[PDB]
Design an enzyme around this catalytic site. Structure first.
Site, mmCIF file in Angstrom:
data_model
loop_
_atom_site.group_PDB
_atom_site.id
_atom_site.type_symbol
_atom_site.label_atom_id
_atom_site.label_comp_id
_atom_site.label_asym_id
_atom_site.label_seq_id
_atom_site.Cartn_x
_atom_site.Cartn_y
_atom_site.Cartn_z
ATOM 1 N N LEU A 159 47.274 48.875 31.101
ATOM 2 C CA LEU A 159 46.485 48.018 30.251
ATOM 3 C C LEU A 159 47.061 48.097 28.843
ATOM 4 O O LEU A 159 47.465 49.171 28.402
ATOM 5 C CB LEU A 159 45.042 48.491 30.278
ATOM 6 C CG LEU A 159 44.021 47.557 29.646
ATOM 7 C CD1 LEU A 159 44.047 46.212 30.359
ATOM 8 C CD2 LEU A 159 42.631 48.173 29.664
ATOM 9 N N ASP A 160 47.094 46.984 28.121
ATOM 10 C CA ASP A 160 47.727 46.973 26.798
ATOM 11 C C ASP A 160 47.027 47.809 25.763
ATOM 12 O O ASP A 160 45.892 48.230 25.956
ATOM 13 C CB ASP A 160 47.814 45.545 26.257
ATOM 14 C CG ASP A 160 48.645 44.636 27.137
ATOM 15 O OD1 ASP A 160 49.007 45.055 28.256
ATOM 16 O OD2 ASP A 160 48.934 43.500 26.708
ATOM 17 N N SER A 161 47.707 48.041 24.651
ATOM 18 C CA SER A 161 47.095 48.788 23.573
ATOM 19 C C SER A 161 45.854 48.050 23.151
ATOM 20 O O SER A 161 44.784 48.634 23.013
ATOM 21 C CB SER A 161 48.057 48.911 22.396
ATOM 22 O OG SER A 161 48.482 47.637 21.955
#
Ligand SMILES: COC1=C(OC)C(=O)C(C/C=C(\C)CC/C=C(\C)CC/C=C(\C)CC/C=C(/C)CC/C=C(\C)CC/C=C(\C)CC/C=C(\C)CC/C=C(/C)CCC=C(C)C)=C(C)C1=O
Ligand SMILES: CCCCCCCCCCCCCCCCCC(=O)OC[C@H](COP(=O)(O)OCCN)OC(=O)CCCCCCCCCCCCCCCCC
Ligand SMILES: NC(=O)C1=CN([C@@H]2O[C@H](COP(=O)(O)OP(=O)(O)OC[C@H]3O[C@@H](n4cnc5c(N)ncnc54)[C@H](OP(=O)(O)O)[C@@H]3O)[C@@H](O)[C@H]2O)C=CC1
Ligand SMILES: CCCCCCCCCCC[C@H](O)CC(=O)SCCNC(=O)CCNC(=O)[C@H](O)C(C)(C)COP(=O)(O)O
Ligand SMILES: COC1=C(OC)C(=O)C(CC=C(C)C)=C(C)C1=O
Ligand code: SF4
Ligand code: SF4
Lengths: 198, 340, 75, 174, 386, 157, 114
Positions: C35-37
């Site tokens: 999952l992205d930052s």
């Protein structure tokens, strides 16, 4: 020929040295133009100090800021040339203090020194993109609310990139990439022959 | 005869479609002129409504793109000059009420046949004729039955003339969606068979418009009888309630015999000023949507249909009360889809 | 004390751009989920709404573990 | 030299004077007298269609292209009217007419673009483009406002008699 | 947000484009954040793409109530850069039409102030006088407003043969017309109330926020750039600056009525002492050649062709020249490369500074007070938005 | 006479006379062409004489005169106010800055014409369109209304 | 090299602010859609916000990132206080523009220059 009064050229020159000595730091290239006008040039860090000395010095009271502007010389590494023009009501004189600022190297704000600058500094950010630290409220003053790009930069197209029309389908005004029906005719005007400088 | 298409694609650009569009003032029309104007096409809009009403169309067209001509259906000469210099003719001429000196057969069949005959004489490259969906010569509503007679005739006046056949249309300013929503004034909302067994598939107006426009600029469509339908069908019950749902107004679906109701339509029909409901309407409303078996329309012609729930919020917002206008569609419950 | 983990697990799977049955307490949003930052940011925010307590700007940076989030929420 | 616009005993006479001013609104009555006075003055308005507000010869008004008395249009397409137009309004493209002379194939003044500066009147060497007296050319459609050579030449022919009189009156000044 | 409302741009109050967001606790204004740019049009960027003479018409549009006085500022600026100065008759003209223009602005400012306040008859009384003045413009320039008469090297064309006489008849009477307005507003038992003690600005604060106009003069600071730094022949005339005390909307008003009076004193003189002479510099280099000359002399055609097609070719430099436009200090900072078209032309607008002061003036004030203060700053959104 | 068509025409005319005699304008007053309109309202060229009221709010306004540049920020507003007026409404564009773009046509912040944001009925030309010219333009709107035949089209529809 | 710092000495100290703005924007979307009565999804809006933040994901220099959020924060302050109206917001969600293709066949077919 304009009615030059050398009496002035000298007195303003003398003040230019006065200021140059008083603030050896932050002040370079002080010169009195052939137009009986002084234009102290200061390192960007000297924005606060040089103005304050001029606003509050008995021998140089420069109470009101006539204008804050930023010419943009694209060639110059430091693109913008913030110019502050100030007036002395007591001495009936005017002076120009001009600094240099690049796009992402902000200048200090003088709203403290003169609150007149609260608006002009917002004007310089909106048009040229220079940023002013410690500004109470920087925000677009002249451009549209959603405008993208700083308009008076020499690298910005006059017509711009977006124009507005009302669209029925969506019943709301809508930007579209600019499509002009007669492009600005760019007359080349410079003459290939110069004028022997007097 | 043609106009090489130059430009980037927006206003002040050229697409090369000079098109007479006789019934542009209409709800569908408005949209047809919109895209045609957006694309940069030359649009000739024949009009018999007063100039004040035609003003809304002026702004979407670029300078010189839109030309308005005075035209009378009974006068053959007016149609003649309109198509003089057009190469595409689009016919959207229909009125659900039968007015005193324009009867249903005249508007649906007589006026189009003459218009199509004129462009064959003019030499227009293509003619697009629009007739209602599920339209058969022995159908229930005269409007539909007539419209069916019409699509035939025009074929003989103009062969290989495209015949898009749209379902009732969903869009702001449409009837299908506003009519039901406006039943609010009526305390009870009659629904034949309590709004059942008349599954209906709405189609967004734009989809229809874009489709129509794409026809004008595509060789694949000749003699094609496309059917712009929609992205989901519905039993009239959910539709009615859903509408009332977004409008945030109570719903009391009341059974009332179509027999007696055809009479209510007759009553409004009696009214002189644009009867709100029509005997011919009533039947149409409870006339079940036909399953797509004709030539595919949307998607086939290049536009993916747009679900009703998506834009319903915009169409029904004005119908809504003082409060609940900030109510948005996703907190609201979307009604179930009945394909049947 | 587990009730927190019960709520934290419910929030992670509901956004539906993460935990397609790979939800684990030891699982780290950045380390394994990918999952992205930014998406993490959304997650912490999410947890804040269900918990009813808004966690600071920084501590979001330290917890990428649903179990560690329950650790902090209990405090 | 400066002046103080508003830079400033209590006696019954004085006070009674001041109190009467507040109590019976004396100064307010003074103001009413002024308006009653004008009510009696002759109104300055003009019947607009029947009587027209005076415009002297230099009025710029509406663009026109003049022609020599012989009938040859004055413009010789030097195209500096295009160069000095501030708004980019005038568009000129030219080619040698069969006569061999130099004439403009297309001369288009976009009046909506034009800001009626009157420099074109100034710039023309043959003075072919002139600011004509007419100011009443309001049009129903935007396209009518765009003007090609034929409209301007036609405008020139219609108003040539007055344009000639106007230029006659003001040329010594220029 | 104290029922924050946004003052209408269409509102009859304002000059048409002022979206003044104001958070108001009931009828009291807590904070005014004026929004600007509803009339930004690009005047500063457009000028960079135009030659000096084709950028002169932009200045008339910057603040068009004061049509000409603005031109004089660009004129002066371009003349300084060229080190050329206009001929003696042209100077007097510019002061003649410079003042007529001041009256025109004050008739606008005082009467439009009243219309927002609610007095409507002063506007009609003085707009008839305005009208008569416009006619001077037209018979001198050709345009009622937006003349383009004052060009960078003097005036464009000598006054018509007969104007001076009429600028006399009018001046001989205008006074009574100012007197009348007075009998209606200066002492109205009600004008005073809505104006007195509203928007008081201290002297130190006025200099600090760069007010530079009547707004400074109204607070008692004595500064008229026309007496302190004379431009044109405003030095050869004699007038009295109308300084004010207890600076407030009423006092400044009185000042604007007094400069209307003092300008009639300056106009009289100009009519009494305007010299015989030429109205444009004789340097075909800067001023376009007379049409008889360009049609009979080769050097004049060449100079006519080059001047209209290419331009002045101002020597490289930069100058900030400020005049005393009716609103306040109007200055043009015109940076110039050797080219015929300018490089930068920041227009200092008396008005960008004044609006900013709206916040520091209208504090703890009612909705009606805000309307009065926008009037006492003579805000023309053209100059502010540029 | 009684054949309805005649009766209808007469009625329409009355309707047209009422709207054409009393047009209540509203002046967005963008820019300067506003000053040239205030002159119309003023005594030399009385607008009221014709039935045009000096001022009106949008709700009660029959005609909108757009005077001055319609900049991109003001463009959403113009529309709003046009959309907030009655069913019989009209727009008189005034000024080269609003007919087309005017001196500021090529700018990035100026809409090239108001007829791109509001349908325009009469275009009054001139940088400061002369007040007499506006008056001519308002009078041509009056002839435009006189010709409108709304009920006869109803009858023949 | 050798460049004075606007806001963050180093990128890890600036991403921080980027995120905080991300938080602020996240929460704002819902309120705007309701107040401005927009025709968009709360999730849709939040999607756009993501798009924007990511568009400028490539920036590596700390100074550029700081001014980007300087601009970003003023953007939401006008978005809030409803200074921007529906028309200035919906513009982000571009509509009424035929997305221009990038396929060479599409560019070759329409448009002289790609
Ligand atoms: C914004 O809305 C407006 C106002 O509010 C500020 C006005 O008051 C005004 C100014 C007021 C005026 C004196 C002009 C308008 C006048 C009228 C509406 C008069 C109406 C006339 C009548 C209804 C006559 C009544 C006749 C009968 C029923 C006789 C029956 C036997 C205008 C024009 C306006 O636009
Ligand atoms: C034994 C004897 C016993 C009796 C003793 C009697 C003693 C003598 C009478 C004493 C009272 C006389 C005056 C009474 C009415 C006036 C009262 C008054 O004071 O007016 C209020 C106001 C004052 O003005 P202001 O400066 O705001 O207040 C200063 C003090 N704070 O003033 C105003 O603001 C007025 C504003 C008016 C706006 C409209 C003006 C219209 C003017 C023309 C119409 C005048 C009336 C016409 C009447 C026609 C017939 C009905
Ligand atoms: N909306 C719907 O219910 C659906 C409609 N259709 C079909 O699409 C077409 C367009 O629909 P829609 O826009 O809703 O129809 P409208 O009711 O909007 O009318 C369409 C146009 O037809 C014109 N018209 C009507 N009668 C006459 C006449 N006697 N002479 C000349 N012109 C006339 C009208 O012009 P004016 O009013 O100015 O006279 C109007 O502009 C219709 O013909 C219909 O058959 C298909 C599916 C659903
Ligand atoms: C519907 C509502 C409309 C609201 C739209 C909104 O206002 C407009 C907008 O979001 S304006 C986006 C600009 N936002 C940035 O420019 C942040 C850039 N931040 C960085 O570049 C970081 O320093 C980093 C290098 C870590 C990125 O790396 P990462 O890939 O994101 O992890
Ligand atoms: C110049 O600014 C303006 C005003 O305030 C000064 C107006 O009131 C008005 C309104 C005036 C009239 C003619 C109704 C206009 C037009 C305007 O632009
Ligand atoms: S200047 Fe006079 S002559 Fe030369 S082109 Fe323009 S109009 Fe024709
Ligand atoms: S047209 Fe001429 S006058 Fe009217 S606004 Fe534009 S510039 Fe000012």
């Amino acid at each position: 020929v304009r009615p030059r009064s050398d009496v002035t050229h000298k007195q303003l020159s003398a003040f230019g040295e006065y200021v140059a000595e008083i603030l050896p730091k932050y002040v370079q290239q002080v010169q009195v133009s052939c137009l009986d006008e002084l234009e102290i040039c200061i390192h960007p860090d000297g924005v606060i100090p040089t103005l304050t000395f001029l606003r509050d010095h008995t021998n140089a009271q420069f109470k009101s800021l006539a204008d804050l502007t930023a010419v943009d010389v694209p060639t110059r590494q430091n693109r913008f040339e913030i110019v502050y023009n100030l007036l002395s009501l007591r001495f009936n004189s005017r002076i120009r203090v001009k600094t240099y600022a690049d796009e992402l190297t902000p200048i200090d704000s003088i709203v403290s020194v003169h609150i007149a600058a609260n608006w002009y500094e917002r004007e310089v950010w909106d048009m040229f993109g220079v940023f002013f630290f410690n500004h109470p409220d920087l925000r677009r003053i002249l451009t549209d609310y959603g405008f993208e790009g700083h308009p008076f930069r020499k690298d910005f197209p006059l017509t711009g990139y977006v124009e507005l029309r009302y669209d029925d389908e969506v019943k709301r005004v809508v930007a579209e990439p600019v499509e002009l029906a007669q492009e600005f005719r760019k007359f080349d005007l410079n003459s290939p022959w110069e004028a022997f400088p007097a | 005869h043609a106009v090489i298409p130059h430009g980037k694609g927006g206003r002040s650009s050229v697409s090369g479609v000079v098109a007479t569009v006789f019934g542009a003032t209409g709800f569908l029309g408005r949209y047809v002129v919109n895209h045609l104007g957006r694309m940069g096409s030359q649009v000739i809009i024949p009009y018999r409504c007063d100039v004040y009403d035609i003003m809304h169309l002026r702004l979407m067209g670029d300078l010189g793109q839109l030309t308005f001509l005075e035209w009378d259906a009974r006068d053959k000469d007016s149609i003649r000059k309109a198509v003089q210099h057009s190469n595409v003719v689009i016919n959207l001429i229909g009125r659900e009420w039968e007015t005193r000196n324009f009867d249903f057969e005249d508007v649906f069949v007589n006026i189009p046949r003459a218009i199509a005959q004129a462009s064959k004489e003019a030499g227009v490259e293509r003619f697009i004729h629009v007739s209602h969906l599920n339209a058969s010569m022995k159908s229930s509503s005269k409007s539909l039955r007539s419209k069916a007679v019409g699509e035939k005739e025009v074929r003989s006046v103009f062969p290989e003339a495209i015949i898009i056949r749209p379902s009732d249309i969903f869009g702001r300013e449409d009837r299908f969606l506003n009519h039901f929503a406006n039943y609010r004034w009526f305390l009870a909302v009659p629904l034949v068979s309590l709004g059942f067994k008349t599954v209906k598939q709405p189609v967004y107006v734009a989809d229809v418009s874009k489709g129509i426009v794409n026809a004008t600029k595509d060789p694949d469509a000749v003699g094609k009888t496309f059917a712009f339908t929609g992205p989901n069908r519905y039993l009239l019950f959910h539709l009615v309630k859903y509408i009332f749902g977004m409008t945030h107004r109570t719903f009391i679906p009341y059974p009332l015999p179509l027999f007696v109701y055809s009479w209510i339509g007759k009553l409004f029909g009696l009214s002189p000023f644009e009867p709100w409901t029509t005997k011919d309407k009533v039947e149409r409303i409870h006339i079940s949507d036909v399953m797509p078996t004709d030539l595919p329309g949307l998607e086939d012609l290049g536009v993916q249909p747009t679900p009703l729930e998506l834009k319903s919020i915009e169409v029904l917002r004005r119908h809504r009360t003082y409060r609940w206008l900030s109510s948005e569609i996703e907190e609201t419950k979307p009604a179930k889809t009945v394909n049947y | 004390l587990d009730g927190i983990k019960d709520r934290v697990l419910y929030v992670l799977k509901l956004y539906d751009k993460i935990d397609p049955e790979k939800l684990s307490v030891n699982s780290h949003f950045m380390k394994d989920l990918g999952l992205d930052s930014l998406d993490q940011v959304e997650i912490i925010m999410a947890m804040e709404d269900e918990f009813g307590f808004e966690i600071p700007d920084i501590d979001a940076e330290k917890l990428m573990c649903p179990q560690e989030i329950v650790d902090y929420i209990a405090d | 030299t400066y002046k103080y616009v508003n830079k400033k005993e209590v006696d019954m006479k004085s006070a009674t004077d001041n109190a009467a001013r507040i109590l019976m609104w004396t100064e307010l009555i003074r103001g009413l007298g002024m308006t009653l006075s004008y009510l009696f003055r002759e109104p300055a308005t003009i019947n607009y269609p029947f009587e027209k507000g005076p415009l002297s010869p230099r009025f710029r008004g509406e663009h026109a292209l003049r022609r020599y008395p012989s009938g040859e249009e004055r413009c010789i397409a030097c195209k500096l009217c295009e160069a000095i137009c501030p708004a980019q309004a005038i568009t000129i493209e030219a080619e040698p007419r069969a006569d061999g002379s130099r004439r403009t194939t297309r001369y288009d003044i976009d009046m909506t673009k034009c800001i009626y500066c009157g420099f074109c009147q100034e710039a023309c060497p043959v003075d072919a483009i002139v600011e004509g007296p007419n100011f009443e050319f309001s049009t129903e459609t935007h396209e009518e406002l765009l003007y090609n050579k034929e409209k301007l030449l036609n405008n020139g022919d219609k108003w040539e008699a007055e344009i000639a009189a106007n230029i006659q009156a003001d040329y010594l000044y220029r | 947000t104290n029922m924050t409302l946004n003052f209408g741009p269409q509102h009859p109050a304002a000059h048409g484009v002022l979206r003044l967001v104001l958070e108001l606790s009931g009828e009291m204004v807590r904070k005014c954040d004026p929004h600007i740019g509803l009339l930004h049009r690009g005047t500063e960027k457009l000028i960079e793409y135009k030659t000096y003479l084709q950028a002169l018409p932009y200045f008339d549009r910057l603040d068009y109530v004061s049509m000409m006085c603005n031109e004089q500022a660009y004129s002066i600026a371009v003349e300084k850069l060229l080190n050329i100065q206009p001929p003696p008759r042209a100077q007097w003209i510019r002061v003649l039409f410079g003042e007529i223009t001041r009256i025109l602005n004050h008739i606008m400012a005082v009467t439009t102030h009243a219309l927002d306040i609610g007095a409507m008859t002063p506007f009609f009384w003085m707009f008839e006088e305005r009208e008569k003045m416009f006619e001077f413009y037209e018979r001198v320039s050709g345009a009622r407003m937006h003349a383009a008469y004052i060009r960078p090297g003097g005036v464009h064309q000598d006054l018509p043969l007969g104007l001076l006489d009429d600028i006399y008849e009018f001046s001989k009477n205008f006074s009574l017309r100012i007197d009348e307005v007075e009998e209606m507003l200066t002492n109205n038992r009600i004008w005073r109330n809505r104006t007195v003690d509203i928007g008081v600005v201290t002297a130190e604060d006025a200099l600090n926020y760069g007010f530079s106009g009547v707004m400074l003069r109204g607070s008692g600071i004595q500064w008229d750039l026309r007496k302190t730094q004379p431009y044109d022949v405003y030095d050869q005339v004699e007038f009295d600056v109308p300084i004010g005390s207890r600076g407030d909307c009423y006092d400044r008003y009185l000042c604007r009525v007094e400069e209307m009076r003092q300008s009639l004193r300056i106009i009289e003189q100009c009519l009494n002492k305007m010299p015989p002479g030429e109205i444009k510099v004789d340097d075909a280099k800067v001023s376009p050649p007379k049409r008889a000359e360009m049609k009979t002399s080769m050097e004049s055609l060449i100079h006519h062709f080059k001047l209209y097609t290419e331009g002045y070719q101002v020597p490289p430099g930069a100058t900030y020249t400020a005049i005393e436009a009716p609103k306040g200090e109007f200055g043009v900072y015109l940076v110039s490369d050797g080219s015929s078209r300018p490089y930068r032309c920041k227009i200092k607008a008396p008005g960008f500074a004044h609006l900013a002061g709206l916040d520091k003036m209208s504090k703890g004030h009612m909705l009606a007070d805000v309307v009065a203060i926008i009037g006492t700053q003579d805000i023309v959104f053209g100059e502010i938005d540029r | 006479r009684s054949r309805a068509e005649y009766v209808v025409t007469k009625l329409d005319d009355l309707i047209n006379w009422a709207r054409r005699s009393s047009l209540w304008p509203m002046t967005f007053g963008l820019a300067c062409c506003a000053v040239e309109m205030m002159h119309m309202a003023a005594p030399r060229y009385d607008m009221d004489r014709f039935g045009v009221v000096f001022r009106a709010s949008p709700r009660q306004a029959d005609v909108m005169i757009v005077a001055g540049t319609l900049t991109n920020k003001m463009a959403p507003a113009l529309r709003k106010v046009y959309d907030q007026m009655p069913e019989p409404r009209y727009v008189v564009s005034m000024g080269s800055c609003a007919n087309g773009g005017g001196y500021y046509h090529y700018s990035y912040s100026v809409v090239r014409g108001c007829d791109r944001i509001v349908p325009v009925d009469i275009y009054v030309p001139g940088c400061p369109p002369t007040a007499e010219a506006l008056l001519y333009g308002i009078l041509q709107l009056q002839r435009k209304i006189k010709r409108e035949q709304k009920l006869k089209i109803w009858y023949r529809r | 090299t050798s460049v004075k710092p606007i806001f963050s000495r180093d990128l890890n100290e600036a991403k921080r602010r980027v995120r905080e703005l991300y938080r602020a924007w996240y929460r704002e979307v819902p309120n705007t859609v309701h107040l401005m009565q927009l025709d968009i999804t709360v999730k849709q809006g939040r999607d756009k916000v993501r798009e924007m933040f990511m568009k400028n994901a490539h920036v590596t220099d700390p100074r550029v990132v700081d001014l980007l959020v300087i601009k970003g924060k003023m953007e939401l302050q006008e978005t809030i206080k409803v200074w921007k109206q529906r028309t200035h917001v919906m513009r982000f969600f571009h509509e009424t523009e035929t997305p221009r293709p990038k396929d060479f066949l599409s560019k070759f077919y329409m448009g002289h220059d790609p």
